[model samples]
Target chain A: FVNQHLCGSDLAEALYLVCGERGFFYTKPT
Target chain B: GIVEQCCTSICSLYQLENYCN
Candidate 1:
C-alpha cells in the first residue's frame, strides 16, 4: 500500500481512504 | 487549503472509496 496513501494526518480523509465513509460505523459493518 | 476543503461530494466519494476498499 506504498503507492496508496493509506495513512494520513487528516482524520476524515484517512478514514475515508481506509474505511470509505468518514463515519464511526463504516469500519464496523465490514 | 484545497486538500482541506470539505465537500459533501468529497465525503461521498470518500465513503464510496471506503466501501470499495
Candidate 2:
C-alpha cells in the first residue's frame, strides 16, 4: 500500500450480497 | 473512507469487505 493511488486500490474488497433490496453492492459507482 | 464494499460477504450485516470485526 503506497501513495500511488493504484497501489492499494489493487487491493479490492471481497463483497457478497446481504441486502437485496436497494441493498446491493459493487466495488465502484453506477 | 470507502473501506469495504457494503454487502456482507463478511460484515456487520450491511457492510462488507466487512465491519464484522
Candidate 3:
C-alpha cells in the first residue's frame, strides 16, 4: 500500500526496515 | 524503486539527507 500521508516517525520506522539499525541517524539539519 | 522512493520522500518531507542505503 502506498502512503499518501507520511509522518516523520513513520518514515523513520520504514527506513529502519530498509537499512536496519543504522538506517537513520538524526543530526542538526543544515 | 523502494530505496529511491524512500530517499526522495524523506528528503522532500523532512528536508533531510537521503538515508536510503
Candidate 4:
C-alpha cells in the first residue's frame, strides 16, 4: 500500500489492535 | 525500529494521542 515502510504482518497485527479486523493482510517483502 | 516503533507509528498516524510513548 505505501512503499512498504511497515512490515505487512506487523502492520496487520497493529491494525487489528488499533482498528479491529477489516480484512487486513500482509505478505513478505522482496 | 522494532515492533514497538511499528505500533507507536501506527498510533501517531491515527492520531491516537497518548496511546503510545
Candidate 5:
C-alpha cells in the first residue's frame, strides 16, 4: 500500500523536509 | 509512482545541483 510505505517514521522526516505543510498532499489524493 | 517521483524530485536532484528551477 502506498500509504503504508509513506506512513513510516523515517519517511515522515524526509517528507517533512521535502513537502512541509504540503506533505499530506504528496501522500494523499485530496 | 517511482518514475514520476524519480523524475520530479529524485533524479532531478541528482542530475542538477539545484532543481525545482
Candidate 6:
C-alpha cells in the first residue's frame, strides 16, 4: 500500500490506475 | 471549426469527420 499521491503525469500519462470504486490506486487516497 | 456535442446514446455514433463524437 504505497499511495504516494502524484497523479496525472507521465510522458504518456501515469494517473496511477484510476478505474476506481475501491479498485487500483497508487494515489488519490481517502 | 469547433464542435462539441459528443459521446451519447451509443456514443453518438462517433464519426468525428463529419459529425458526432
Tens digit per residue, CA lDDT, model 6, A2-28: 322221232001122322233322232
The numbered model that scores best in DockQ is 3
Model 6 residue B15 lDDT score: 24
What docking tier does model 4 reach?
A: incorrect
User: Per-prediction DockQ, in order?
Assistant: 0.07, 0.10, 0.18, 0.07, 0.08, 0.02
- Model 3, span B1-21: residue lDDT tens: 333454454334333235654
Once model 6 is optimally superposed onto the true structure by TM-score, how far is the C-alpha of residue A9 displaced, in angstroms?
0.6
What's the count of clashing pairs in each model shown?
A: 3, 0, 0, 0, 0, 0
lDDT of 1 by residue, A1-30 (tens): 222222223433445455654353223121
Better of 2 and 4 by DockQ: 2
Q: Candidate 1: misplaced stretches above 4 Å?
A: A1-9, A25-30, B1-21
DockQ of candidate 3 is 0.18
Q: How far is B3's C-alpha from truth in model 2 (Å)?
A: 8.6
Q: By DockQ thresholds, what CAPRI class is model 6?
A: incorrect
lDDT of 4 by residue, B1-21 (tens): 333455444334353222233
Weakest ten-residue segment in model 5 chain A by summed lDDT? A1-10
Q: Residues A1-30, candidate 4, lDDT per residue (tens digit)?
A: 222224446665554554553443334442
Q: After superposition, how far is residue B17 of candidate 1 from its true place, in Å?
A: 14
Clashing pairs in 5: none
Query: Is model 5 an incorrect, acceptable, medium or high docking prediction?
Result: incorrect
lDDT of each: 0.35, 0.29, 0.46, 0.41, 0.35, 0.22
lDDT of 2 by residue, B1-21 (tens): 333322212234333323222
Q: Residues A1-30, candidate 5, lDDT per residue (tens digit)?
A: 122222334344444454555432234332
DockQ, Cα level, model 4 = 0.07
Off by over 4 Å in 6: A10-30, B1-21
Against the true structure, what is each candidate's TM-score? 0.24, 0.22, 0.34, 0.32, 0.30, 0.16
lDDT of 1 by residue, B1-21 (tens): 113232211333443343343
Question: What docking grade does candidate 1 earn?
Answer: incorrect
Q: Is candidate 1 or candidate 3 better by DockQ?
A: 3
